[PDB]
């Protein structure tokens, strides 16, 4: 009681052997921009799948950077996360790793992982999350690998991991290692044929991240905002995800918002049986409570805590493409940007051009990148990007090399405290100053692939016809440009094409198609400036361009979908 018995037993067992076991390679462990996600039974039931991938990650690191180095390990709290973390501890011990900094019970949000990596000078980190995907025995499981800068491994590293995993023959593991992920503090293990002991530091999940955020924002003004008598009634929905504890400690305990403010803030291994995705579909409960009109501010997070959804009173949903534009138009309400200044704005291409309005009003440069973190991090490490956001509920700054949902919530709270206006009023002022960029996005999830790819090809060849550019459509829009978006990275000279079908109208409106069973994504972004037509239902003002997109793409006849699975 407590560490005593474990220490005496550790001494009685003596040094723990390190053994090499044979394995057969899999041919589908190809990690993308968001790590490697399969079904949970892939990692739980398939023999040596997890061991093969983890050993491939270790083999992807040079031996000179592996020996005494520190590696952050943490997840969002999914089913099977704990046992896989234990396997990571054993294999990491056998692969000669200096120390593993793990959050208590394996709980560390992706922004927290980036923060700790950049703080303790770690070689990297392994994040056990599938982000917004569902979790559980019949759900999805994912493994991300971040490097020493705090961000996800670039394509060369994730590659090398994949090519190694296709040919892996054996792995090293310390099977008799038993670590208690539940108790904070340091735990060392004597390894056989090794003189130096292996170290596992179980750290508080929230402490470091909360300290960083305490340096980013003015926690005093947030105290006066969330904890006072005249307090801003907030309703934060963590969707049973990783951010719950952070909401409890940061927003509720430290900043003083009472416990009523948080909901679904206890991480569950199945996320309560729902998709931890913050949008108008999977987070409809939050919008339905926001319909009551008692709360002035609402927000939702995803599985690993890099997404955020922002709602105002009576469910005044603000789209991410707009939200980043409001954060940029009021960027000096945050002390961090006061200290650093604004080096640049950036958005994913399918994001609405609302950010370009504040980027052109001020003269801070704006970079339009494809979907994915590689380009945002590329511009961040060159001191060219200060605030970024993507339509996929992505908002973040250069404080870390991952996007951060709770950071965006604290930024919005800072803007509300500074301006002393409601969310809706602030966005009305924004829409009148810059002109509203009506934005919508339709998600047709898991349609069969061949028909979707054939639609994108036939449609693509329809754009490529010179008789298309110029031709008009009635409600009246005129086609100006039509291409498949490509991007030349200004940092490393990288190229990336087939990033989405872009249709630019002389009106400034854009219709974008993208393909992710396969999921079809429809992005629609029109601009409007005259004051008599900026306060309407966006579905109605956008219905023309939606009809043009569905009719030109012939999507329903080729997919049988009647309505999109998700609306934004
Ligand atoms: Mg996520």
Swiss-Prot record:
Q: Which GO terms describe its biological process?
A: carbohydrate metabolic process; galactose catabolic process via UDP-galactose, Leloir pathway; gluconeogenesis; glucose metabolic process; glycolytic process
Q: How is it modified after translation?
A: Phosphorylation at Thr-478 by PAK1 significantly enhances enzymatic activity.
Annotated phenotype, changing residue 522 to P: In CDG1T; decreases strongly solubility
Recite the UniProt keywords alphabetically. Answer: Acetylation, Carbohydrate metabolism, Congenital disorder of glycosylation, Cytoplasm, Disease variant, Glucose metabolism, Glycogen storage disease, Isomerase, Magnesium, Metal-binding, Phosphoprotein
Main EC class of this protein? isomerase
**Record-listed alpha-D-glucose 1,6-bisphosphate binding positions:** 37, 131, 306-307, 371, 390, 392, 403
Which residues does the Swiss-Prot or TrEMBL record annotate as the active site? 131
The UniProt record lists the keyword Phosphoprotein: yes
What is a single molecular function from GO for this protein?
Answer: phosphoglucomutase activity
The entry summarizes how activity is regulated as: Glucose-1,6-bisphosphate enhances phosphorylation of the active site Ser-131, and thereby increases enzyme activity.
Which chemical reaction does it catalyze? alpha-D-glucose 1-phosphate = alpha-D-glucose 6-phosphate; O-phospho-L-seryl-[protein] + alpha-D-glucose 1-phosphate = alpha-D-glucose 1,6-bisphosphate + L-seryl-[protein]; alpha-D-glucose 1,6-bisphosphate + L-seryl-[protein] = O-phospho-L-seryl-[protein] + alpha-D-glucose 6-phosphate
Mutagenesis / variant outcome for changing residue 402 to K: In CDG1T; decreases strongly solubility
Cofactors required: Mg(2+)
Instruction: Look up what happens after changing residue 277 to G.
Output: In CDG1T; strongly reduces phosphoglucomutase activity
PTM annotation (Phosphothreonine): residues: 129, 199, 478
> Mutating residue 52 to Y: effect?
In CDG1T; strongly reduces solubility; increases aggregation
Give the EC number.
5.4.2.2
User: What InterPro entries does UniProt report for this protein, alphabetically?
Assistant: A-D-PHexomutase_a/b/a-I, A-D-PHexomutase_a/b/a-I/II/III, A-D-PHexomutase_a/b/a-II, A-D-PHexomutase_a/b/a-III, A-D-PHexomutase_C_sf, A-D-PHexomutase_CS, Alpha-D-phosphohexomutase_SF, PGM
**Result when mutating residue 33 to A:** In CDG1T; strongly reduces phosphoglucomutase activity
Query: Phosphoserine: which positions carry it?
Result: 131, 148, 215, 220, 227, 383, 392, 488, 496, 516, 547
Report the co-factor binding details: Binds 1 Mg(2+) ion per subunit.
Q: Which disease is it linked to?
A: Congenital disorder of glycosylation 1T: A form of congenital disorder of glycosylation, a multisystem disorder caused by a defect in glycoprotein biosynthesis and characterized by under-glycosylated serum glycoproteins. Congenital disorders of glycosylation result in a wide variety of clinical features, such as defects in the nervous system development, psychomotor retardation, dysmorphic features, hypotonia, coagulation disorders, and immunodeficiency.
According to its UniProt entry, the function of this protein is described as: Catalyzes the reversible isomerization of alpha-D-glucose 1-phosphate to alpha-D-glucose 6-phosphate. The mechanism proceeds via the intermediate compound alpha-D-glucose 1,6-bisphosphate. This enzyme participates in both the breakdown and synthesis of glucose.
What PANTHER family does the record tag this protein with? Answer: PHOSPHOGLUCOMUTASE-1, PHOSPHOHEXOMUTASE FAMILY MEMBER
Subunit comment = Monomer.
Query: What is the protein name stated in its UniProt record?
Result: Phosphoglucomutase-1
């Amino acid at each position: 009681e407590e560490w005593i018995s474990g220490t005496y037993r550790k001494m009685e067992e003596g040094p723990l052997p390190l053994l090499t076991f044979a394995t057969a390679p899999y041919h589908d462990q190809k990690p993308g921009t968001s790590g490697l996600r399969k079904k949970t039974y892939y990692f739980e039931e398939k023999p040596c799948y997890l061991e093969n991938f983890i050993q491939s990650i270790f083999f992807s690191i040079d031996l000179k950077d592996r020996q005494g180095s520190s590696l952050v390990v943490g997840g969002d709290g999914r089913y099977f996360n704990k046992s896989a973390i234990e396997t990571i501890v054993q294999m990491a011990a056998a692969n000669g790793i200096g120390r593993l900094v793990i959050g208590q019970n394996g709980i560390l949000s992706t922004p927290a992982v980036s923060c700790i990596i950049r703080k303790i000078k770690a070689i990297g980190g392994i994040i056990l999350t599938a982000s917004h995907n569902p979790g559980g025995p019949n759900g999805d499981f994912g493994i991300k690998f971040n490097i020493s800068n705090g961000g996800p491994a670039p394509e060369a590293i994730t590659d090398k991991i994949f090519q190694i995993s296709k040919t892996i023959e054996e792995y090293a593991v310390c099977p008799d290692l038993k670590v208690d992920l539940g108790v904070l503090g340091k735990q060392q293990f004597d390894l056989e044929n090794k003189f130096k002991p292996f170290t596992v530091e179980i750290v508080d999940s929230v402490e470091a991240y909360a300290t960083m955020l305490r340096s980013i924002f003015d926690f005093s003004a947030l105290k006066e905002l969330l904890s006072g008598p005249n307090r801003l009634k907030i309703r934060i929905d963590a969707m049973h995800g990783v951010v719950g504890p952070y909401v409890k400690k940061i927003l509720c305990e430290e900043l003083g918002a009472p416990a009523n403010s948080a909901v679904n803030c206890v991480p569950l291994e199945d996320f309560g049986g729902h998709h931890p995705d913050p949008n108008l579909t999977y987070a409809a409960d939050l919008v339905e409570t926001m319909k009551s009109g008692e709360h002035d501010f609402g927000a939702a997070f995803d599985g690993d805590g890099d997404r955020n959804m922002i709602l105002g009173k009576h469910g005044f949903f603000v789209n991410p493409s707009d939200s980043v534009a409001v954060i940029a138009a009021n960027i000096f309400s945050i002390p961090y940007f006061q200290q650093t200044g604004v080096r640049g704005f950036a958005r994913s291409m399918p994001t609405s051009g609302a950010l370009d309005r504040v980027a052109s009003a001020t003269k801070i440069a704006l970079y339009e990148t494809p979907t994915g973190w590689k380009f945002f991090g590329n511009l961040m490490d060159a001191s060219k990007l200060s605030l970024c956001g993507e339509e996929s509920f992505g908002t973040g700054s250069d404080h870390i090399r991952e996007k951060d949902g709770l950071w965006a919530v604290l930024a919005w709270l800072s803007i509300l405290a500074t301006r002393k206006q409601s969310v809706e009023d602030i966005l009305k002022d924004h829409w009148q100053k810059y002109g509203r960029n009506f934005f919508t996005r339709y998600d047709y999830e898991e349609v069969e692939a061949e028909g979707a790819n054939k639609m994108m090809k036939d449609l693509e060849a329809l754009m490529f016809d010179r008789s298309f550019v110029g031709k008009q459509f009635s409600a009246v829009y005129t086609v100006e440009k039509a291409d498949n978006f490509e991007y030349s990275d200004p940092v490393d000279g990288s190229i990336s094409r087939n990033q989405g079908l872009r249709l630019i109208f002389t009106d400034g409106s854009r219709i974008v198609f993208r393909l992710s069973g396969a999921t079809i994504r429809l992005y629609i972004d029109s601009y409007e400036k005259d004051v008599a037509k900026i306060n309407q239902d966006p579905q109605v003002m956008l219905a023309p361009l939606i009809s043009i997109a569905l009719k030109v793409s012939q999507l329903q006849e080729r997919t049988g979908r009647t309505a999109p699975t998700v609306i934004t």
